[PDB]
């Protein structure tokens, strides 16, 4: 189907800038109005900027919140939408989606605005009919991490908990429950990627 895919998120300090983009495939990009919609706890889904077509002289539109700070643009030849985001404040933290009104959303790219430092997680094994295992993913910044088990093979019986923030560091755990007949006798491994630090780590749960 039509597919919208954002990129370019990460961390920057307040007063700094970011430039994010999305590529749209599965249709002719140049014939569609395109927008950015961000999501955060305090303000929920928030439309921020929109751009029309070449035949409209690429007319742009902005939410008051971001007027003077954000600029939306498009490169029809690359099927790519951009958002230049300047003079950022902590409240500009959120997940940024390309939204093709009113039908299509991307997967979102995460933007954090903070003076705190990027820190990769320490990843610790949690070893003890059915057997429950886990990993402790402690002391990382910013969000997000992605946690998988057995490189994504092990998906059912998994609980990855929301992170908690303390002293500018996040911590979460993930549990997996499997048949005892399945562990320790085939292996169970947690994999933890932290995009901001460019790190990936695996930890085998061993008795």
């Amino acid at each position: 189907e039509v597919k919208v895919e954002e990129s370019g998120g990460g961390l920057v300090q307040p007063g700094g800038s970011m430039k994010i983009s999305c590529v749209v495939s599965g249709l002719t990009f140049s014939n569609y109005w395109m927008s950015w919609v961000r999501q955060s706890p305090e303000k929920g889904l928030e439309w921020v900027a929109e751009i029309r077509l070449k035949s409209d002289n690429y007319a742009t539109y902005y939410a008051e919140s971001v007027k003077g700070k954000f600029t939306i643009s498009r490169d029809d030849s690359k099927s790519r939408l951009y958002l230049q985001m300047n003079n950022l404040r902590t409240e500009d933290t959120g997940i940024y989606y390309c939204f093709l009104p009113m039908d299509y959303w991307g997967q979102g790219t995460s933007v954090t605005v903070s003076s705190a430092k990027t820190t990769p997680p320490s990843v610790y094994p949690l070893a003890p009919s059915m057997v429950t295992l886990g990993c402790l993913v402690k002391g990382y910044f910013p969000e997000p991490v992605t946690v998988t088990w057995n490189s994504g093979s092990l998906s059912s019986g998994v609980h990855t908990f929301p992170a908690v923030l303390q002293s500018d560091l996040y911590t979460l755990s993930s549990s997996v429950t499997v048949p005892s007949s399945t562990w320790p006798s085939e292996t169970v491994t947690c994999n933890v990627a932290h995009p901001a630090s460019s790190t990936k780590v695996d930890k085998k749960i061993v008795p």
Partner: peptide, 8 residues
């Protein structure tokens, strides 16, 4: 415009 959403 602006496009607006309910709180969910």
């Amino acid at each position: 415009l602006p496009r607006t959403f309910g709180g969910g």
